[PDB]
Amino acid sequence: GSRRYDSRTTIFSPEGRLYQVEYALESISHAGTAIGIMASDGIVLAAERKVTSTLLEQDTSTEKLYKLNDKIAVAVAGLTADAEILINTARIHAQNYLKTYNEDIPVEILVRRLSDIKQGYTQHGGLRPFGVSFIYAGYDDRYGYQLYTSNPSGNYTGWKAISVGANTSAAQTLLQMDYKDDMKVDDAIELALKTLSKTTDSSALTYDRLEFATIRKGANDGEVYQKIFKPQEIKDILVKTGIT
Amino acid sequence: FIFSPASGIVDKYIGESARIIREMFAYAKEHEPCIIFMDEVDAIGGRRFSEGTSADREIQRTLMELLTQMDGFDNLGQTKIIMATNRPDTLDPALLR
Amino acid sequence: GVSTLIAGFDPRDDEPKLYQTEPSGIYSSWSAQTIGRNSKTVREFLEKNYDRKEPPATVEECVKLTVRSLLEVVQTGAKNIEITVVKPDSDIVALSSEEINQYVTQIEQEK
Amino acid sequence: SMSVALHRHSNALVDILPPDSDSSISVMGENEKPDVTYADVGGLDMQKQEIREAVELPLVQADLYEQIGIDPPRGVLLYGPPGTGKTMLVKAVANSTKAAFIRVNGSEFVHKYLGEGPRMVRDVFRLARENAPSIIFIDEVDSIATKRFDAQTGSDREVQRILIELLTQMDGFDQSTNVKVIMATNRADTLDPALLR
Amino acid sequence: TRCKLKLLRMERIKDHLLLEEEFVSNSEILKPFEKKQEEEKKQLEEIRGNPLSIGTLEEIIDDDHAIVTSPTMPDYYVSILSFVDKELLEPGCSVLLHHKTMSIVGVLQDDADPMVSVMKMDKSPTESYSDIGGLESQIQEIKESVELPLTHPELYEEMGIKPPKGVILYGAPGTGKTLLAKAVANQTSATFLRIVGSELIQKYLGDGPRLCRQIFKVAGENAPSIVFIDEIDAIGTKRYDSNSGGEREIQRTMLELLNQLDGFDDRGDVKVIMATNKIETLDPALIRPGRIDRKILFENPDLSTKKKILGIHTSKMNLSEDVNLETLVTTKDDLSGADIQAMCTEAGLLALRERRMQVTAEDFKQAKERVMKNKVEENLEGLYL
Amino acid sequence: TVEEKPDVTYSDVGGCKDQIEKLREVVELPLLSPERFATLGIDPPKGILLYGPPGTGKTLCARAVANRTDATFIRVIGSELVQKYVGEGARMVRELFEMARTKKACIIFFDEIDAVGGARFDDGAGGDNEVQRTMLELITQLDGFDPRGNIKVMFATNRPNTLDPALLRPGRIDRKVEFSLPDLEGRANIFRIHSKSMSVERGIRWELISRLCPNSTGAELRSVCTEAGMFAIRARRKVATEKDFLKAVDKVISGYKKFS
Amino acid sequence: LTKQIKEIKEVIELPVKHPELFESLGIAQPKGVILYGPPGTGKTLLARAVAHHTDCKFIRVSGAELVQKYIGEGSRMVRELFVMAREHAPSIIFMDEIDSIGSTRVEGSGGGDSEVQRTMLELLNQLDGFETSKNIKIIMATNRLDILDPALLRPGRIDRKIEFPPPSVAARAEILRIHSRKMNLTRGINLRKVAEKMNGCSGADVKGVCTEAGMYALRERRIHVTQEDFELAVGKVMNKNQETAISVAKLFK
Amino acid sequence: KTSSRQTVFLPMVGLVDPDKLKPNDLVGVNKDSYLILDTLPSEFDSRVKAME
Ligand SMILES: Nc1ncnc2c1ncn2[C@@H]1O[C@H](COP(=O)(O)OP(=O)(O)OP(=O)(O)O)[C@@H](O)[C@H]1O
Ligand SMILES: Nc1ncnc2c1ncn2[C@@H]1O[C@H](COP(=O)(O)OP(=O)(O)OP(=O)(O)O)[C@@H](O)[C@H]1O
Ligand SMILES: Nc1ncnc2c1ncn2[C@@H]1O[C@H](COP(=O)(O)OP(=O)(O)OP(=O)(O)O)[C@@H](O)[C@H]1O
Ligand SMILES: Nc1ncnc2c1ncn2[C@@H]1O[C@H](COP(=O)(O)OP(=O)(O)O)[C@@H](O)[C@H]1O
Ligand SMILES: [Mg+2]
Ligand SMILES: [Mg+2]
Ligand SMILES: [Mg+2]
Ligand SMILES: [Mg+2]
Structure with a gap:
């Protein structure tokens, strides 16, 4: 019946290593490059899309850059589909923190919460984890600008x-x-x-x-302005830095 | 008339099946009028491999050697093949063309 | 797939507690213990450098013994070496890399 | 080192043979294509031109190519769906070339021995040179080539050996006075990963 | 100066004296050839002729005849003849047969073969103990088994158990087991045969086993002996083709060796050293656990061990005054002595490239980079992170 | 290879096993009293196939019964010998079988007939087929003069999946027995024989070493004793303790488990 | 292949000419050289190149060496190769075998081809001692380390592991540089065009442009190569690659 | 086909019948010059025996 078609998807190997997580890292290597660099006055997030076409509208697309809250945005590298769930979980969680403490969420808290979900899926339910890696740009008062990477196992x-x-x-x-x-x-x-x-x-x-x-x-x-540059504002900076 | 079953020509010795139909063919070219009966061709049928073992690749070579004799630099004259297959779904589009 | 070393004090106690829990669901107290990579190697070192009868008398000799054990496998400056000391009844101090560097140099020179 | 004649009863070198001798037969039929010409074609008129440009044209006019400055035309791979004659394409051209033509098969490179198979492909390559210019057509290389390298029993290793030697020998050393070998394939899924190119 | 002069004195008189005595004697022998000698040498020529075909003596039949096997495909029933008798012969010895009419006319080979030449060595090994330095505990399993019963078999008799018999060197490449075999055999003070088991593989029939048989015969003459059959893994179980074979002779050879282990009398005086990559590179059919005794398991050098090994190498290496041994050891994790050997050589290559006599610490890092290169593992932080 | 009533009893075989009492039933019972079989109208058994892992002691047991039953013991092992070469082994099989039958009160053992009196070996390590002549001779010979006058036929196979069905049919084999990996207390017993021969500690617990071991054959227990001897010599004692055997078991287990 | 030339001079030339210098400054001698990298890089062409200047007998040896059978089997001419090479001193052996034995017989040390190869390698050590030092280079050439034989496997087990890089843009331009003279020099110096537009994984792809370019010039009945002859020629060679790159560039997740 | 590994085309000898001479008839042939001298029964392998 039910046990017939299950293969025990999430279990350790003799090395101790979780099959689905190992597999997940391969599929994130398919997806495009995303780089984060933490300056002493900001965080730069720069990502090259995994799709391009002359018929693809890329002038309204924000398929890698998504704002979780007013001071924390992410760049995406992995499955766009899988990432979408975590992105709206993050928005709910940040707003929940704002509702209860009337204070903006620190970058550490938000990343940790998402990480717990990814661990949880391999721990129980037989669920596949989210095969995405995010780079979080975030500002908080306490630690200033903070840069973070998360991996599909659920560790930051x-x-x-x-x-x-x-x-x-x-x-x-x-x-x-x-x-x-x-x-x-x-x-x-x-x-x-x-x-x-x-x-x-x-x-x-x-x-x-x-x-x-x-x-x-x-x-x-001393306020923080998140600016997601349009491709023609990128173009302006492309001639500035002499790429073109 | 050569009644030959196609499961009958198969050997683990590579190119032995290719050897067998090539000689059968040379005999037929001499012995005109001749019809070569390839019966139950479905045995050495199927297509692909190259992630298979070299037994399959030989079956694919034999299947291909067939292919050499008919059309290529050799031709049929007043030689003639009848192929019999018991399932057409084992049988391959390269021979349904 | 996680094993822990849980250590500390109880309230109104100056008795140090050192326990090890493992993912089996078993736990054991220890006078000294080591887990993780090359736990056998560190443990063998501790047979000669630790006595059941006599622990390190002072805080400082305990700290330098733990630095000394790490300097076997870990090495590579005080960068990768961490030391946390807990002293009786909720006194937690963490000894920064600078403090560790001093301890490392003394052990190195003496040796 | 080449073949030579020895007397039967004197057992000595009395007479010499061409090296062409004691090597693979070159077309086991008659060399040329049966009544089938450019008239009968019916294709593919353009692509047939591209085949003429590749195979016959250097061989007929060497001087012309020397003017452009390029090295002479590289091997041809004929792939596509079947019933395109692609095999007939080579025979039609070769007819009209008026140069030697060599007809060995991939199902003739086979062996039930040890290294006897690679040795057969070797007699073709050298033989091409001796009766130069020469048009070499191999009918199949589909299961004589391997995408994934195997050596499960000894009998997987023998097929592999023929692949190795084909590549290395392919290649230019003294450089080719031939048109560089032509091969045909039902598909390229059953060729090597990158060693054709 | 005077240490030269004294040696000079002795060495000149002995060499020179001898030359004059040899030079005169060649004449003194040849002048008289009257009586016994002329007769003897003459008969020996007549019974013989020219050319003489090599043979092999399979067996003697007790009627002054023998069964012989020629290098030509035929085999033959021959008469025993000449000055060489069946008492003076022994089976398995190479013998001279006259071409035209097969009869043993003599011997001059006396069981000398191109395999026999390679096996022979009665001299002490080249390596002495801790050339081969270190894998001390590994030596402290091989010595127990190999050195000790030869030295005093007494020990085992008082202990009350059968002596040890053979050893199987097996486990990690690059630990020097092919070198180690040498080290021990020096220490004991014994004769050391060495043969590579690849040369006991033959495409000729009945030849495979003849070559295995020669080894134990030789071993018994020069006893105590330690015999090294290098690479029994290379007889293995392998196959050349399966459509023209080659996999018959492999078995017959493997078999002839399993029998003479015990079957060359129950002795630890006919020791064997079998080096093998693993046991599952051998024919799985095997003799019982005590017949081969202790199996010696080589594993990777630990941190302390590869200081020792590294240290040996770099002393030989000249113009490295800017290298400190410890720092090499810190960066590296556990690895064979094999790869230390390579790193030291790659570091000479780099410094020769640059055209600078010195060899830096910095230089060595570049060599680590090259060796480690394609060992990379990112599933280490796949599990950990 | 052939012997002649070798002195081994059940005392020297470590433990009594079920497979020994099944041997008693084939071998001793018809020799001692073929009378009871006759009055019953049950045929007396004379065929036994012995199969198991090697090093279980099957060879010790055949001799044990050889001594008890008082019957001369002829051991042939065909894959040990080189007599296999195209029916050359067929002669070994023909001759010895007929000779043993002449002898009254006798036991014939063709041992390791996995090949060399066993199935083909074309798909095997070798490409052999010389083995099938030697199999051809063996089949006939066990019907040429039956009832054999109380002469027992033993067969050794490692795996009984390497023996021909012609051979398996009745009369050739009238009992089938699997040798079992000896129990923990049963290893205390196999150990006891080796340890009594060795100068050891008096008051040693045999049962302590057997507790420490998992299921290991008796050949292993013989190697462990030699091994412990070695470590005893190294310290310069010639009298061993329970301690040298703790070491000896650790060596073997880690060593062998991994591979063969 | 700028780096590769400079490394291999030290490797091949210097042990031959001065075996003592090589030992004095550094340590030891090489017991081998192993060439690997993508096809078409011209590693076979490299071994020919260096051997010219070395002044030794570049024999090569093509393919598998079980191929001899007509005076007797090839199951010991591997072994005895040691001897043959010694005789014809000073000699360079280009024993080539591109490898297609896979991962299967790496396990163990199986295969009868691998045994004989193993035996030659066991021999191979002795050369530093059998007439002193090295003066004969054993240059092996294989495509990769995965499909390799067991005896040749581990880093430095046959000495010198040299990966050949796919060429850079600057390298592609130099490979192009030489073929241009051989052909008729371009009008308008449009050499940089080709190099910018694509970079290959092989020196073969570069070469592929030269030949492709002369199809178009020939037809136009103009000898001289031009920018237009070039634009058609780079478009033809890049076609093969764009098509497999649009299927992961578009219609992906 | 001889057991000396040769293929030889022989003029039929009048001594024997053409009806005995089949594919794999075992035949006696004269040692010197090669001429079918006589006929022999067929031998059967050990593979044949088990089956039958
Ligand atoms: N252009 C043509 N004009 C005339 N007849 C043609 C033409 N093309 C093909 N044919 C006919 O179809 C036959 C099949 O073509 P051909 O034998 O060359 O096949 P192929 O594409 O090489 O297949 P495979 O994949 O089996 O190698 C020819 O022998 C010929 O009779
Ligand atoms: N004990 C040692 N002290 C010094 N050098 C050593 C020592 N052990 C090994 N080495 C070095 O490493 C080299 C490799 O050892 P060796 O050739 O004996 O390998 P192996 O373990 O027999 O491998 P394979 O599995 O290929 O037979 C030696 O030639 C020597 O240079
Ligand atoms: N650097 C170069 N300059 C010029 N031509 C080049 C260069 N490299 C390669 N080529 C061209 O590519 C062809 C193929 O290269 P070659 O066959 O020598 O490759 P390889 O890297 O040794 O491959 P394999 O993996 O098949 O052994 C050459 O014959 C030559 O025409
Ligand atoms: N049950 C046992 N008691 C004692 N020794 C044993 C036992 N079983 C096996 N051995 C030891 O192992 C050795 C080899 O076993 P052997 O009699 O040749 O058997 P098999 O036919 O099962 O392979 C014996 O000679 C003996 O020393
Ligand atoms: Mg075709
Ligand atoms: Mg070795
Ligand atoms: Mg037994
Ligand atoms: Mg190449």
Whole structure:
């Protein structure tokens, strides 16, 4: 009956290792490059789409960049379908924190909550986990700008500069040589574009296949302005940094 | 008339099946008028492999050797094949063409 | 797939407690213990560098013994070495890398 | 090193043979295509041109190619659905070339021995050179080539050996005075991963 | 200066003296050939002729005849003739047969073969103990078994149990078991035969087993002995083709060896060293656990062990004054002595490239990078993260 | 290979097993009293197939009964010998079988007839087929003069899935017995024989070593004793303790479990 | 293949010419060289290239070596290769075997081909001692480490593991550079066009442009290659690749 | 086909019948010059015996 068609999907291997999580990391390597760089005045999130076409409208698309709350946005690298569930869970959770403490959610809390769901699915129910890796750009008062990567097992790790998805190794090695702690958002915008030009997922990097967003404290009175740049505002910055 | 069953030509020795139909063919080219009866061709039928074992690849070679004799640089004259198959669904589009 | 070392004090007690729990559902108290990679190697070191009869007398010798055990396998400066000390009745202090560096250098020189 | 004649009863070198001798027969039928011409075609008029450009044209005019400056035309892979004559395409052209033509099969490269199979493919390659220019057509390479490398028993390893040797020998060394070998395939799923190219 | 002069004195008189004595004696022998000698040598030529075909003596039939097997496909029933008798012969010895009419006319080979030449060695091994340094505990299983009964078989008699018999070196590549076999045999003070089991594989029939048989005959003459059959894994169970075979002879060879383990008399005086990659690279058909005794399991060097191994290598390496041993050990995790050997050589290559005499610490890191390169594992933080 | 009533009893076989009492029933009972079989009208058994893992002691047991029953013991092992080569082994099988039958009161053992008097071996390690002549001779010989005058035929096979059905049919085999991996207390007993021969500690617990072991054959227990001897020599004692055997069991278990 | 040339000079030339220098500054001698990388990189062409300057007998040896059988079997001419090579000193053996034995006989050390190869390798050590040092290079060439034989398997087990990179844009442009002279030099220097538009995984793809370009020039009845002859030629070679790249670039998740 | 590994085309000898001479008739042939001298019964392998 019911037990006949089950194969015990989520279990350890003799190494201790969870089959579905190992498999999940392969499918995130299919999905495009997403890079996060934490400057000392913001966080730059820059992602190259895994789809491009001349018939594809990419001028209203925000398929990787999604705002969870006013101070925390994510870039997506993995299954867009799977990610959608976690994105609306995050919105509910951040609003719930705001409702109960009348204070904006710290970046640590929101990431931890999502991580618990991913662990839970391999723990019980036989459910597949979400095969996505997110880079969280977030501001909070206490720790300032915080950068985080989450993996499909359900664990989060802090960084200063990091890449997930396609070409994680190549992007990382370039970042190690170029990254400095004296970098500003201006410098980080230029670095992100250059790294994506050397880790390009075809033979060209273009504005229309670039999604780009920052969170900058350069808005007046110490306030933080999340700006998701349109592809023609990306184009302006593409000529500025001399990619084109 | 050569009544030959096609499950009858199969050997683990590679190219032995290809050898057998090639000689059968050379005999038929000499012995005109001749009809070659390939009966139950479904045994060495099927298509693909190359993730199979070399037994399959030989069956695919034999199936292909068939293919060589009929059309290619060899032709039929007053030679003639009748192929019999008991299931047409084992049988392959390359021979239903 | 997770095993823990749960340690601490009870309220109005200066008795140190060191327990190990494992994913089997069993737990055991220990005078000293080690889990994780190369637990056999560290444990073997502790047979000669720890006595059941006599624990490290001072806080500092206990701290340097734990630094000394880590400097076997872990190595690689005080970067990857962490030390948390709990002292009786809710006094938790964490000894930063700078503190650890001093302890490492003393052990290295002496050895 | 090449074949040579020895006396039967004197057991000595009295006479010499061409190296062409003691090597594979070249078309087991008569060499040329039966009454089937460009008239009968009925295709594929353009692509047949591309085949003429590749196979006959360098062989007839060498000087012309020397003018462009390019090395002479590389091997041809004929793939597509069947009933396209692709096999007939090579025979029709070769007819009209008026150069030697070589007809061995992939189902003739077979062996039930040890290394006897790779040795047969070897006699073709050298033989092509001796009776130069030459048009080499192999009818099948589908199950003589392997996408996934196997060696499950000894008998998987023998097929593999023929693949190895074909690639290495393919290749240019002294450089080819032939048109570079032509092969035909029902599909390329049963070819190698990247070693054709 | 004077240490030269004294050696000079002795070595000149002995060599020189001898040359003059040999030089005169070749003449003193040849001048008289009268009486016994001329007669003897003459008969021996007549019974013989030219050419003489190599043979092999399978058996003697007790009527002054023998069964012989030629290098030509036929085999033959021959008469025993000449100065060589059946008392002077023994089965399995190579013998001279006259071409035209097959009869044993003599011997000059006396069981000398191109396999016999490779096996022979009665000299001490090249490596002594801890050249081969370290895998001390591994030596402290091989020595127990191999050195100790040869030295005093007494020990086992007082203990009250059968002596040890053979050892199976098995487990990790790159631990030097092919070197280790040498190290021990020096220490004991014994004769050391060495043969590679790949040369006991033959495409000729009945030849496979003849080659296995020669080994134990030799071993018994020069006893105590330690015989190294290097790579019994290479007889293995393998197959050349299965459509023209090659997999018959493999079995017959494997079999001839299992029999002479015990069957060459119950002795730990006819020790064997069998090196094998794993046991499941052998024919699974096997002799019982005590007949081969202790199986010696090689495993990866630990942190302490590979300091030892590394240290050996780098002493040999010249112009490395900027390298400190410890720091090499810190960065690396557990690995064979094999890969230490490579890293040291790749580090000379880099420094030769650059055209700089010195070998840096920095240099060595580049060599670590190259060796470790394609061992990468990201499913380590797949489980951990 | 052939012997002649070798001195082994049930005392020297470690434990009494069910498979020993099934041997008693084939071998001793018709030899001692063929009378009772006759009056009953049950045929006396003379056929036994012995199969199990190796190192269980099957060989010790055949001899045990050989001594008890008082019958000369002829052991032939065909895959040990080199006599197999195209019917050359067919002669070994013909001759010895007929010779043993001449002898009164006798036991014939063709051992390891997995091949060499067993099934084909074409698909095997070898490409052999020499084995099928030797099988051909064996089949006939056990019908050439029956009733045999109380001469028992034993057969050793490791796996009884390597023996030909012609051989399996009745008269050739009249009892079938699987040898069992000896029990923990039964290993205390197999150990006891080896340990009494060895100079050891008096008051040793045999049962302590057997507790520590999991199911291990008697051949293993013989190797462990030699192994413990070695470690005893290394410390410069020639009198062993329970301690040398703790070591010895650890060596074997980790060593063998992984592979063969 | 800029890096690759510079590494392999040290590897091949220097042990031959000065076996003592190689030992003095560093340590040991190489016991082998193993070439691997994608097809079409021209590794076979490299081994020919370096051997010219080395001044030794580049024999090669094509394919499997079980192929000899007509004077007797090829199941010991692997082994005895050690001897044959020694005789013809100073000699370079390009024993090639591209490998298609897979992962199957890596386990164990199975295969009879692998035994004989193993036996030659056991031999192979002795060469540093049988007439002193090395003067004969054993250059093996295989496509990858996965499909490889068991005896050749582990890093540095036959010495020197050298991965050949797929060529960079700057490298593609240099590979293009040489074929241009051989052909008729372009009008308008449009050499950089080809290099920017695509980068291959092989020196073969570059070469593929040259030949493709001369189909179009030939037809137009103009000898000289031009930008237009180039634009058609890069479009033809890139067609093969764009089609398999639109199916993961579009209609994906 | 000889057991000397040769294929030989022989003029039929008048001694024997053409009706005995079948595919795999075992035949005596003269050692010197090769001519069908006589006929022999067929031998059967061990593979034949089990089955029958
Ligand atoms: N262009 C043509 N004009 C005339 N007849 C043609 C033409 N094309 C094909 N045919 C006919 O169809 C037959 C089949 O073509 P052919 O034998 O070349 O097949 P193929 O495509 O090579 O198949 P396979 O996949 O079996 O190799 C020809 O022998 C010929 O009779
Ligand atoms: N004990 C040692 N001290 C010094 N060098 C050592 C030692 N052990 C091994 N090495 C080094 O490592 C090399 C590799 O060892 P060796 O050739 O004996 O391998 P192996 O374990 O027999 O492998 P395979 O499975 O291929 O037979 C030695 O030639 C030597 O240079
Ligand atoms: N660097 C180059 N310059 C010029 N031509 C090149 C270059 N590299 C390769 N080629 C071209 O590509 C062809 C194929 O390369 P080759 O057969 O030598 O490759 P490989 O990397 O050794 O492959 P395999 O994996 O089949 O052993 C060459 O014959 C040549 O025409
Ligand atoms: N039950 C036992 N008691 C004692 N020794 C045993 C026992 N079983 C096996 N052995 C030991 O193992 C050895 C080899 O077993 P053996 O009699 O050849 O058997 P088998 O036919 O089952 O392989 C015996 O000689 C004996 O030393
Ligand atoms: Mg066709
Ligand atoms: Mg070795
Ligand atoms: Mg037995
Ligand atoms: Mg190549």
